[PDB]
């Protein structure tokens, strides 16, 4: 059965209530010991959590039982769970990345724990699945359409979330110009596009133009990741509120590799907010003042 689904370019629960995602990502794969984060994230008002999983290509695979446990943590804490395979990141540029087909192999393997959870879980097929290599960025639309068709053929009814090329930022506007072709390829219409806004989106003009393109065309869109400063997070949040689009900040805690300033809380301590955590949860157009829990939990 279908749970969350798309109607007229927007996201709805099965009872017909519109759902506007207001959440954060949590690096579950890399920090399995920090499962308290699910309740901590809920305590600050988020309605969704984007969970980092691995299909075993680049990190250690999250098996079915582990994924079942993450889904119950989401449900227990009344959060919609967006699961994502992180191994696809930067494919065609990043050495050892997974392809979307390898991500799809993994989702099919979890079929028995995901089927029947369509009201609670969204499947983000693969994070930022192309880097900037021109020849593989040119395959974004065909590869993404192929992955959707495989998932629907395996019986998945969930709403699927697909990321853009150019490491998620789509500065080539490949996702923007071709999302109509990809959307048409899902027989159920339950596909949502996801843009990640970092340094390409430091100007308000670029942010606004990108979001309006999708809203004016009825193409479903969420801001799957964004950071602060240098993207203009003030405009990203204001515009997401004005246009009623979902957004998900990166990330709860535990950033390494130079982006330690993207931690929202220090050392996974839910009461120890950084300035980014205070901006995204408690600032203007922030999670605590704008998010609404999914009505499926009432």
């Amino acid at each position: 059965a279908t749970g969350l689904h798309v109607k007229n370019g927007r996201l709805y629960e099965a009872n017909g209530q519109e759902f506007i995602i207001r959440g954060v990502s949590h690096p579950h794969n890399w920090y399995p010991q920090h499962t308290q984060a699910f309740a901590d994230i809920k305590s600050h008002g988020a309605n969704t959590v984007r969970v980092v999983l691995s299909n075993g290509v680049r990190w250690s695979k999250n098996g079915p039982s582990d994924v079942a446990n993450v889904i119950s943590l989401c449900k227990q804490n009344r959060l919609i769970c967006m699961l994502e395979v992180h191994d696809t990141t930067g494919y065609g540029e990043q050495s050892g990345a997974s392809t979307l087909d390898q991500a799809v192999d993994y989702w099919i393997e979890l079929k028995s724990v995901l089927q029947g959870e369509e009201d609670y879980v969204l499947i983000n097929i693969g994070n930022e699945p192309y880097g900037n290599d021109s020849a593989t960025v040119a395959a974004w639309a065909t590869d993404t359409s192929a992955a959707i068709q495989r998932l629907r053929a395996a019986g998945f009814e969930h709403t699927l979330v697909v990321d853009a090329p150019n490491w998620g930022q789509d500065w080539t506007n490949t996702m923007r110009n071709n999302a109509d072709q990809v959307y048409a390829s899902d027989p159920t219409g339950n596909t949502v596009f996801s843009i990640h806004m970092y340094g390409v989106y430091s100007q308000a003009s670029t942010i606004t133009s990108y979001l309006e393109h999708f809203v004016n065309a009825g193409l479903p869109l969420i801001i799957g990741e964004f950071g602060h400063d240098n993207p203009d997070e003030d405009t990203i949040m204001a515009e997401a509120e004005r246009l009623k689009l979902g957004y998900i900040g990166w990330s709860w805690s535990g950033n390494g590799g130079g982006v330690e300033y993207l931690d929202m809380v220090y050392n996974f301590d839910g009461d120890n907010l950084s300035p980014w955590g205070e901006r995204i949860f408690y600032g203007p157009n922030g999670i605590a003042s704008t998010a609404k829990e999914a009505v499926i939990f009432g």
Side-chain angles (χ1 to χ4, degrees), residues 1-114 116-259 261-298:
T2 61
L4 292 157
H5 66 284
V6 177
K7 188 176 83 129
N8 310 303
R10 289 171 172 275
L11 186 64
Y12 295 89
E13 304 192 76
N15 68 344
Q17 283 295 291
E18 185 181 3
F19 188 62
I20 298 168
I21 288 173
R22 288 288 181 265
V24 300
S25 287
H26 164 62
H28 179 67
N29 186 256
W30 308 313
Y31 294 92
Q33 72 275 18
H34 287 307
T35 46
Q36 87 278 341
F38 294 89
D40 293 345
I41 286 167
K42 177 67 167 185
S43 78
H44 290 290
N47 62 17
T48 306
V49 58
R50 179 165 179 254
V51 186
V52 177
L53 299 177
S54 173
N55 60 353
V57 165
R58 218 177 133 196
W59 293 286
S60 339
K61 182 151 128 200
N62 293 95
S65 268
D66 176 358
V67 173
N69 186 240
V70 165
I71 292 159
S72 42
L73 290 178
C74 276
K75 288 166 82 186
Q76 157 162 8
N77 290 289
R78 289 152 77 92
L79 290 161
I80 289 300
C81 228
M82 178 182 302
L83 302 183
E84 65 100 354
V85 167
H86 212 79
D87 308 70
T88 43
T89 305
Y91 171 83
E93 203 185 332
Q94 170 70 49
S95 176
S98 170
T99 60
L100 279 167
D101 198 57
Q102 289 171 306
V104 164
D105 287 348
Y106 175 72
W107 292 120
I108 290 177
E109 210 193 315
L110 306 174
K111 189 207 224 129
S112 66
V113 296
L114 302 165
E117 303 298 348
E118 295 83 12
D119 295 301
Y120 303 99
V121 171
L122 297 161
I123 298 180
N124 189 187
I125 306 182
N127 185 64
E128 300 184 357
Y130 299 90
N132 298 320
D133 169 69
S134 290
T136 47
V137 164
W140 177 85
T142 175
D143 285 354
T144 301
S145 278
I148 292 162
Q149 274 154 177
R150 265 196 82 203
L151 284 170
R152 290 309 181 207
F156 288 80
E157 291 189 276
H158 307 73
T159 287
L160 305 167
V161 180
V162 299
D163 274 21
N166 298 121
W167 301 85
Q169 300 199 77
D170 205 32
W171 60 253
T172 58
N173 289 299
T174 299
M175 175 169 92
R176 192 194 177 138
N177 289 335
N178 300 287
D180 52 359
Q181 172 196 328
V182 168
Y183 190 75
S185 84
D186 183 351
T188 76
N190 298 319
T191 283
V192 169
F193 294 99
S194 176
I195 183 66
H196 290 182
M197 298 179 156
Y198 292 98
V200 164
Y201 297 92
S202 54
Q203 283 295 329
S205 65
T206 306
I207 294 160
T208 291
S209 175
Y210 199 91
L211 305 177
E212 281 188 359
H213 187 269
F214 283 73
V215 178
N216 291 342
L219 287 162
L221 178 70
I222 58 150
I223 300 147
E225 289 192 13
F226 67 106
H228 58 82
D229 290 342
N230 334 253
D232 175 354
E233 84 276 15
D234 292 318
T235 296
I236 294 167
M237 295 168 75
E239 297 289 73
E241 260 311 282
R242 170 176 82 79
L243 291 175
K244 292 197 299 151
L245 296 175
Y247 64 68
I248 302 174
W250 183 273
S251 63
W252 184 241
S253 204
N255 276 292
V259 295
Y261 58 92
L262 293 183
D263 290 351
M264 291 171 184
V265 298
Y266 298 116
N267 300 304
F268 291 90
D269 174 352
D271 290 315
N272 197 183
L273 292 170
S274 72
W276 171 219
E278 287 275 353
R279 169 73 187 87
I280 200 175
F281 281 105
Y282 300 110
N285 298 296
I287 291 179
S289 67
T290 62
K292 297 283 167 256
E293 176 177 280
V295 306
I296 185 95
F297 299 110

